[PDB]
Structures are given as C-alpha cells and as structure tokens.
Amino acid sequence: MSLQHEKVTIAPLVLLSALDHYERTQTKENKRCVGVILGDANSSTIRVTNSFALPFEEDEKNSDVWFLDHNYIENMNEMCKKINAKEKLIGWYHSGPKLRASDLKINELFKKYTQNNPLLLIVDVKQQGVGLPTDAYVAIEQVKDDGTSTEKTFLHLPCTIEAEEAEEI
Amino acid sequence: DTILSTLRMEADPSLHPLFEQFEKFYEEKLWFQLSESLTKFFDDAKSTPLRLRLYDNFVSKFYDKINQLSVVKYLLASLKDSKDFDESLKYLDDLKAQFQELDSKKQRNNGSKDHGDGILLIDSEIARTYLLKNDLVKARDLLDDLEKTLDKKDSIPLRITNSFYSTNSQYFKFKNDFNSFYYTSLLYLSTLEPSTSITLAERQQLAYDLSISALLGDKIYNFGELLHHPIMETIVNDSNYDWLFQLLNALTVGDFDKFDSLIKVQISKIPILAQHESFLRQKICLMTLIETVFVKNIRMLSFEDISKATHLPKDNVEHLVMRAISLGLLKGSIDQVNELVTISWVQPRIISGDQITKMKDRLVEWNDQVEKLGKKMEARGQSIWV
Amino acid sequence: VLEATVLVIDNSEYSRNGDFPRTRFEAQIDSVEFIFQAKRNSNPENTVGLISGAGANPRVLSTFTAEFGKILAGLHDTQIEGKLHMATALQIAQLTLKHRQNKVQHQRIVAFVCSPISDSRDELIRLAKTLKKNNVAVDIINFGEIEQNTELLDEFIAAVNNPQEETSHLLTVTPGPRLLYENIASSPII
C-alpha cells in the first residue's frame, strides 16, 4: 500500500470550485457540500488540481442515512478523461467546517474508484479560520491510543496551497 | 435422518433438543439457523464425543452451504484436545482441498467470497499443530507466509487476526521469547473480539503467562500497561496468582525487601523464574533508578544516591547505568573522577491527573509570555507591519 | 406509466438461507430480474434502483437507472453479510426518490425482507407516515421469517394504505413449490 501522505499541494482552482459549489447549491447552515478532488498521485507529494460537483445528500439524523450517487462519479470520470487523461480521482472533499461522523464511513465508498488511499480535504468555505482553510485527512489504520482495538482513522497532513503556471497567472 | 438417528442417542439428553433443531433445519435448508445452534453447543464442554463425531458427520453435508468461519470453527473445537496431530494435519489438508475445490472456479453469483480467510485460518491452525508437533522452524516459516498473506487481503476483516496473533504468541511462548510474546499477546488482546472470550481459566493462564513474560522480558521496563488493562481482571481477584500481582506492584513501586521475600518464596513455583533471577534483580535496579530519576528530578545525579536507592555498591552503579543507557531508558553520560552522572531525556511515563494541573499552569505562563512578546512586537513596529 | 422505483434487496445472514431453492439471495435476484423486466415492458422510461439493506449500514449499489448491466454487475459484487437495518434502508430509498431525473415519475419502492424486523415500532410507523406524506408507495415481499415480519408488515401497510394514490400492496407468500416471480406477478403488481 502506498504511503503517499507526506505533503499535500492544492491548486487554487479546486478550492474556488468548492466555494462556487457551496454558493451555487444554496447550502444553508449544517448542510455540508461534497465533491471530488481530481488530480495526480503515486508520488510522495499528493497534488490536487481539479474538482467538480457531486449530488451528495444527507439528513441531519442518523449518520447512516447519507446518500450519494454512484453513477455520477464514473460519468464525470469518463468526460474528464476525454478532456484530460492526466487527471485521476484521488478522493473527495467536503465543504467544512470540521470533521463529521460519516467521514470515515463515506471514505470507503471512494475506495474502489480511487487507486491509492482516498484523500479527505476539509474546506473552510465560509471562512471562519485565520490560517489556511484546507487540511488533509488520510484514512489509515493504527492502534488505539487507549490500548484498545486498532482503528482505521484519519491522519492530518501538512497542506500547502501552491499554484502552477496556468493558475498563478 | 440415518446419521442423525445414530448421533441422536450418542450424547446427553440435554443436547437432544439441539439434535431435533438440527434435523428440523435440515428439512428445508435453514442451515444458517442450524449453524447457530451448532456453535451454541460446540462451545459447551459437553460436546466431547460430539466434537469427535457430529462435525465429521453433519458438516460433511453442509460444509458448502454455510460461512466458512463456522465450518472451520466446528472442526477447531474437535481439535482442541486430540493428540492425532498427524491425522489432524490430514484433516486440515482435506479442508484445504475442499475449499480449493469448491472455491477453485465455477464462481457463478451465489454471493460467496472464495473464502480465502478460511484458508488463512486453516494454515494458522496447521502452524499451531506444527508447534504441537515440535516443528518450530516449519511453524515459523508457515506463520511468515501467513503474515505475508496478511499483507494482502486489503486490511483483512479481523477474525484471522485473532488466530494469527494467538499462533505467534504461542510460538514465542514455546521459544521463550518473552518480549515478543508480551508484544504479540498485547496486540492479540487489543484485537480480541467480543464474539467469544474462550475459557475463563485459559484466559487466566494467558494473563499469567503475559505477566511472566513481562517480568522476564528485556525491552519492558514499565508494567503500568498490563496492570490497568482488562486482561488483569482475570486474576484481579484470584489468590493463586496473587503473589505475582504483588510482585509486579512492588516492581512498579520499587520495594526491595518485599521483592526479596516474594522472589525467595516463589522462586520454586517455576524453574523459569529461577533461571532468570539475576535478570529480575537487574530489573529491580533499573526500576529504582528510573523512579528515583523521575522523583528527585535534577539533570545530574551522584554515585552515592544511586547506590543508596538501588542497594548496589558504589562500584556497580556504573554497569547499572551502562545497561540503562544501552536499553534506551536514558541518554545520559557518566563521569567517574567526580561522580556526577548526567541525565538527559528520560523514558516517558503515563501521566496522572495531578500532573495535568502543573502542565496546564506552565502552559498558561508560556502563553502569557508569548502574548506579551507579541503585543510588544506589534506596538513597537506598527509603522512597517504592512 | 412513468414510475421511478427503487429495489431494496436484502443480503442479511438470514437471507442467505435456502428455503427457496437455491437461496433467498438468488430468489431475490431473480425477483429483481422479473420486476425490472416488467417495469421495462410497462414503460421503458421508468428508472429502477438497487439498494442493499445489509452489509453493515445499507450501501447504494446504483442510482435510478433503466439498464440491467450495471445493477447486475452490482448483484454479483454484494456479499451476503450483516443484518437488515430496514429503517435506514427505507430512509435512504426515500432520499433517492427525491432525485429522479424525470421529476414526474411517481415514487415506488419494492422491498425484499428475509429477516426479523427488529426495529423501533414507533419509529417504523413514523417512517411509514413520512413515506405516505411524500406520496411514496412501498411494497414488501415477505418470504422467510413470516411469523414475525407479518406483525409489522401489516402495520406498515395500514400506516401507508394510500386510498387514491399509489396503493401499497403487501405480499406474505408462504414458501411454496412454485416460481417466486410467478407468485409476485399478479397479487402485488396488478
């Protein structure tokens, strides 16, 4: 299994698409927004480059009532591959504001579509933060800190916002 | 009904209604509810002839209709006492042959998973029998193949972890690898599942062995993890092994005379402890050194203080700190012309509730200093902060 | 009739049983086959869905679609594990019905049950009345643990019981030596 979670690099386009998504679907409070984080991987520094909207739905109830379309991921995959075959699915992002209960559960849905470990990207879309509004959370399995059964949980990674020539301009 | 009739009276009447349930569920292929009762009675100790015969008769029909976990478990219950390890190995090979015959090919829906996990459990039990067969090298190679397969199966879904870790723990116990046994047993206990906790007496003996290995393990120098773990609840009340619990408490505290008396009385309980008595005394000395460093604090020390707090002469303190540094407890440096042992970073310890308040107050003071420095910096250079 | 439907198949350990040869799982798959074919014949515009109610929390296998290939591939890749949390499965099925590509197709649900309904009865009635309020039509095809499921199945239908809307039809066919889709062809469908 690839250990590629040392560094995370985000182009501003993914993040601005996140903000556009949130302001588009008219998400009120407590309504999280989720999409995919198309980019390139298999190197030490995971790099996020492009994103798109997803029809994620969830009632503010039992955490297992979350709904997400399966065909949409592959349907976007085909068109994006037609546009550019160098961008592969490397996980998903949610529109903040902080980690929720279903994050571990829903991440397993993207296991098959992704090739490496799926990447979580928290986006402070409403901008309560002061530092960078982005942080990565790779789901890995490690022993419990309380001396109990090993848990497959998220690990924070140092995320730096960096742009390429196309987006810096 | 034929073999059902033969096995109906080859048991106790209390188990007879279970036979009726097995017959009823066999009529309309309700074999999962049949396997529920099969597990229900297999765990019970009443199944000594039933483990021998009922498995090989009943499950010969339903082995290709039920989840392979229960199927292998039913045979495992049979092989919990038998000394037929040659024919037991033949049984395990037959299980492998059947699983690599059905799940070999022709996979056409019907759910299923090709049941590789059952094969892994079968190989783990082959390694267990090899250990019982005194096949130490062969068993070690087999469990190496098992951990290789553990690397596969994309984060295997428990179960196989239980059997694999138990097998490695048994191998380390038979090889007297105290540290490896301790770590593997702790990992197994962490990975233990609530479906079954096997025999209470067997788990008590496992806790006894864990305590022995922790006391006789080299790279273990803090027994707090074992003491405040649920594994110690098995002998948290029993008096037969209360002596070693008292000895462990003295080890953690650092008592000398009580340790001497207890080790003298219990040196004859097992020759294994009698062989490594000097290692236990060195463990006492290292316990005392670490606890004295952590209590008296002070980045420096003296030969006389260590000699008084460890009962060793002022000439053997040097070798004591040699062992302490080599094992990784400290990172200090000795000085013999003036006995001024220097101490640096010390092995961490589990933090109690009282220590939180002191650390919190120190945090508050540090944060206040940082805030004052930031305020001064901002006020002084506001003309260029743009 | 333009009718968006979702099929709540059950893959619980009890659904692994084989009262219907070969297994309740295979029988449920064949019933899904028949229901999809019948809905296609009635109108190809109708979209069918596949949601599995077992394997820990229910996992959506495919959204509202009319093509058998993807769902059938999903049917071959759903292991028979876990229990049937039918409350969460029904809530998820209701959530899916909000996102029909054709916003005119009326909501339909056909659920397969092969395990006891060990759910909160009051919560179950609340779910049933919520489904009725959204005009959601639900059909339950019972084969297996009929002695228990039929205690709550009639309560579900009497809580939904749409008089003028798409009326909910209950089927509790006792395991019989006839083809299952033949049993479901007439009474619950027409």
Side-chain angles (χ1 to χ4, degrees):
Chain A
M1 153 81 76
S2 57
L3 93 174
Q4 328 304 308
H5 28 255
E6 301 76 28
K7 298 198 301 320
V8 195
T9 300
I10 320 185
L13 164 64
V14 154
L15 174 168
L16 285 193
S17 294
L19 181 46
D20 183 340
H21 193 341
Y22 193 86
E23 301 315 309
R24 177 249 323 276
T25 86
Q26 301 300 119
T27 36
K28 324 100 178 179
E29 310 312 316
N30 314 359
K31 292 282 178 177
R32 55 202 273 93
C33 169
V34 179
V36 181
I37 56 159
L38 267 53
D40 53 348
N42 305 26
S43 297
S44 68
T45 309
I46 301 308
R47 177 165 334 97
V48 197
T49 49
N50 187 6
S51 99
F52 61 82
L54 265 199
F56 176 119
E57 304 278 352
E58 163 197 358
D59 200 341
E60 281 76 3
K61 284 187 175 178
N62 194 340
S63 185
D64 304 88
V65 198
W66 95 75
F67 157 68
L68 176 142
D69 178 14
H70 256 307
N71 315 43
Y72 206 92
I73 288 121
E74 282 168 345
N75 233 1
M76 269 327 98
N77 207 156
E78 298 300 334
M79 331 305 278
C80 277
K81 275 205 302 315
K82 289 185 189 169
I83 306 302
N84 188 8
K86 284 188 174 180
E87 326 274 17
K88 323 300 301 293
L89 275 82
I90 183 60
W92 66 325
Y93 79 99
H94 67 241
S95 65
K98 49 155 41 183
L99 293 166
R100 310 222 175 188
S102 291
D103 316 347
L104 272 179
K105 332 193 70 186
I106 309 188
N107 185 78
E108 302 302 326
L109 163 149
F110 287 126
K111 270 290 187 186
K112 52 154 153 172
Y113 302 100
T114 45
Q115 166 197 359
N116 325 328
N117 34 29
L119 184 46
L120 197 62
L121 221 50
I122 57 103
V123 164
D124 181 7
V125 86
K126 330 156 202 166
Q127 292 147 338
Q128 309 53 71
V130 278
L132 306 178
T134 89
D135 198 354
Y137 284 124
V138 154
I140 47 166
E141 31 271 46
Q142 71 213 297
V143 85
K144 225 155 178 159
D145 302 15
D146 322 66
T148 318
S149 305
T150 283
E151 306 287 341
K152 33 183 204 312
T153 182
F154 292 118
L155 155 72
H156 143 77
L157 327 170
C159 156
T160 69
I161 282 178
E162 178 261 11
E164 300 139 30
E165 171 46 3
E167 312 206 350
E168 181 63 45
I169 219 68
Chain B
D1 318 76
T2 308
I3 321 101
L4 276 144
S5 86
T6 72
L7 263 280
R8 167 60 207 273
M9 271 324 306
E10 205 245 342
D12 308 39
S14 297
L15 321 153
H16 287 17
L18 315 176
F19 283 88
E20 317 314 299
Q21 304 140 25
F22 310 149
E23 193 166 358
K24 289 156 191 175
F25 297 146
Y26 180 79
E27 293 193 25
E28 58 257 24
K29 306 107 182 185
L30 290 197
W31 21 256
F32 175 57
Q33 310 197 10
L34 159 136
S35 48
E36 300 156 18
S37 39
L38 285 191
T39 304
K40 260 171 36 189
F41 98 97
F42 252 104
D43 318 333
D44 273 30
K46 275 194 150 204
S47 168
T48 89
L50 309 184
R51 281 138 182 170
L52 261 302
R53 275 298 88 225
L54 194 145
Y55 157 69
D56 320 65
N57 302 0
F58 282 44
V59 199
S60 65
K61 292 300 178 172
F62 274 158
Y63 103 98
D64 266 354
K65 253 158 172 183
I66 301 193
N67 66 95
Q68 95 295 343
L69 308 149
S70 50
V71 171
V72 301
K73 204 266 187 186
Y74 296 150
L75 167 135
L76 290 211
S78 299
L79 285 179
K80 281 173 47 59
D81 58 340
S82 159
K83 266 62 195 177
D84 204 1
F85 317 108
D86 192 313
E87 203 270 335
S88 311
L89 278 164
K90 213 53 61 154
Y91 266 158
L92 306 193
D93 298 331
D94 298 334
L95 293 205
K96 282 192 92 290
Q98 307 148 333
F99 278 120
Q100 297 160 276
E101 185 286 309
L102 168 89
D103 294 324
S104 57
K105 210 32 80 190
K106 87 167 182 322
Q107 321 290 145
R108 194 201 51 61
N109 194 194
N110 287 261
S112 85
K113 205 220 62 174
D114 80 60
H115 279 350
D117 37 27
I119 308 168
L120 318 176
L121 306 169
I122 290 169
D123 311 318
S124 82
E125 268 299 328
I126 295 156
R128 212 209 66 189
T129 55
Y130 264 31
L131 169 162
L132 306 172
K133 269 285 190 162
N134 302 8
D135 302 354
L136 320 158
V137 285
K138 338 179 203 164
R140 145 69 39 184
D141 306 349
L142 182 49
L143 59 92
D144 295 340
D145 319 325
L146 255 286
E147 64 62 19
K148 295 163 185 172
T149 59
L150 175 275
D151 180 274
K152 345 292 184 182
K153 302 289 179 174
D154 50 63
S155 87
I156 87 171
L158 220 60
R159 277 295 187 166
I160 318 104
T161 57
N162 192 317
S163 177
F164 168 80
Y165 278 104
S166 173
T167 289
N168 313 293
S169 73
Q170 273 303 326
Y171 167 76
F172 290 139
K173 167 177 183 179
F174 263 67
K175 211 188 173 183
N176 291 13
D177 198 331
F178 301 95
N179 306 264
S180 290
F181 175 86
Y182 177 84
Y183 289 136
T184 287
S185 306
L186 279 194
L187 294 191
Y188 154 65
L189 256 294
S190 164
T191 335
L192 190 68
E193 97 294 356
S195 182
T196 179
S197 63
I198 50 96
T199 119
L200 171 135
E202 185 176 25
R203 100 177 179 177
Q204 278 206 357
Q205 203 59 29
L206 182 134
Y208 166 87
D209 288 333
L210 187 60
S211 70
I212 276 190
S213 76
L215 261 197
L216 287 195
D218 294 13
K219 336 294 172 321
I220 277 80
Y221 281 115
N222 220 321
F223 316 101
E225 316 95 34
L226 164 140
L227 261 81
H228 78 318
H229 196 275
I231 183 63
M232 265 305 106
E233 285 150 349
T234 83
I235 318 171
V236 82
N237 39 312
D238 166 46
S239 174
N240 298 18
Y241 312 122
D242 197 19
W243 58 273
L244 59 94
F245 206 102
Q246 302 147 13
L247 174 60
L248 269 158
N249 200 3
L251 254 292
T252 45
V253 167
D255 269 349
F256 333 91
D257 318 332
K258 307 188 187 178
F259 156 82
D260 303 332
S261 46
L262 281 176
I263 206 177
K264 289 153 191 164
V265 180
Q266 319 286 313
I267 211 69
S268 314
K269 261 53 175 195
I270 45 144
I272 329 169
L273 209 151
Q275 292 143 6
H276 322 79
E277 172 191 10
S278 74
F279 174 73
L280 218 49
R281 304 186 170 279
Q282 215 73 8
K283 221 163 195 162
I284 286 293
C285 265
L286 294 167
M287 285 326 149
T288 50
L289 188 54
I290 287 189
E291 76 204 358
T292 42
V293 153
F294 220 159
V295 163
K296 314 278 191 166
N297 310 338
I298 309 181
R299 308 304 98 180
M300 316 66 63
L301 258 198
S302 67
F303 277 28
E304 43 89 14
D305 179 31
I306 304 183
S307 189
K308 298 299 303 310
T310 64
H311 299 220
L312 273 192
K314 216 166 166 176
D315 320 338
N316 277 328
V317 166
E318 303 86 316
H319 296 134
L320 208 162
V321 198
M322 300 295 199
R323 294 204 46 74
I325 304 307
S326 52
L327 269 157
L329 316 174
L330 308 94
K331 287 168 177 142
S333 295
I334 311 322
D335 178 348
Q336 196 170 143
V337 55
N338 43 345
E339 299 84 354
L340 242 176
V341 161
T342 292
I343 298 312
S344 62
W345 165 89
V346 152
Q347 177 88 304
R349 192 157 52 149
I350 297 198
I351 295 188
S352 76
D354 325 294
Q355 324 169 222
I356 307 180
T357 309
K358 328 155 192 152
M359 300 234 287
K360 216 219 58 172
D361 293 335
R362 285 180 223 177
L363 257 283
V364 163
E365 189 166 6
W366 187 22
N367 153 79
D368 274 280
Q369 278 180 339
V370 157
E371 178 264 3
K372 269 205 309 303
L373 201 280
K375 263 192 37 199
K376 293 186 47 188
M377 257 194 33
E378 162 61 37
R380 273 300 285 101
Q382 50 94 5
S383 300
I384 55 103
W385 288 142
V386 46
Chain C
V1 52
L2 265 67
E3 184 72 349
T5 315
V6 79
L7 293 205
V8 201
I9 202 143
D10 167 36
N11 277 189
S12 47
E13 329 282 348
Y14 281 175
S15 177
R16 135 193 286 272
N17 259 350
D19 58 3
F20 284 66
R22 168 111 37 78
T23 52
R24 308 185 191 181
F25 165 80
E26 286 290 336
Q28 285 161 117
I29 279 193
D30 304 343
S31 306
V32 152
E33 247 117 9
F34 176 50
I35 290 177
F36 158 80
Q37 293 143 9
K39 220 164 63 89
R40 199 62 48 238
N41 307 138
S42 312
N43 217 339
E45 324 306 302
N46 324 322
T47 57
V48 86
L50 189 76
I51 166 68
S52 66
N57 50 351
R59 294 183 43 251
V60 161
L61 259 284
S62 291
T63 194
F64 292 176
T65 67
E67 311 87 16
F68 196 18
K70 328 163 307 310
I71 42 190
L72 157 71
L75 302 168
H76 287 280
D77 258 359
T78 160
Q79 327 284 56
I80 322 169
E81 226 288 325
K83 75 167 305 308
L84 190 63
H85 327 73
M86 207 211 327
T88 61
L90 277 186
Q91 274 280 24
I92 281 187
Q94 205 286 138
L95 276 198
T96 48
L97 282 164
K98 144 160 56 89
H99 316 101
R100 309 158 312 190
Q101 270 279 89
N102 294 4
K103 284 297 170 319
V104 67
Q105 299 213 337
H106 327 86
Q107 323 85 51
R108 196 77 197 185
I109 297 185
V110 166
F112 293 6
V113 179
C114 289
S115 66
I117 314 177
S118 46
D119 314 53
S120 318
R121 159 160 265 180
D122 44 350
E123 195 33 77
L124 289 184
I125 306 153
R126 161 183 306 103
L127 294 194
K129 66 138 287 305
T130 325
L131 302 211
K132 183 224 279 194
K133 281 319 117 187
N134 288 353
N135 274 27
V136 174
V138 282
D139 283 340
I140 300 152
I141 310 172
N142 194 354
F143 63 98
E145 212 93 10
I146 324 189
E147 81 277 21
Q148 164 44 269
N149 298 354
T150 327
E151 307 174 351
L152 284 158
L153 286 200
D154 37 357
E155 198 192 42
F156 263 65
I157 204 140
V160 172
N161 57 316
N162 269 328
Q164 68 284 348
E165 321 156 35
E166 276 288 341
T167 305
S168 57
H169 324 120
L170 172 62
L171 195 76
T172 52
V173 153
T174 302
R178 302 159 305 115
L179 256 289
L180 179 55
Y181 53 82
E182 161 193 12
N183 306 354
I184 322 169
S186 56
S187 314
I189 294 176
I190 68 183

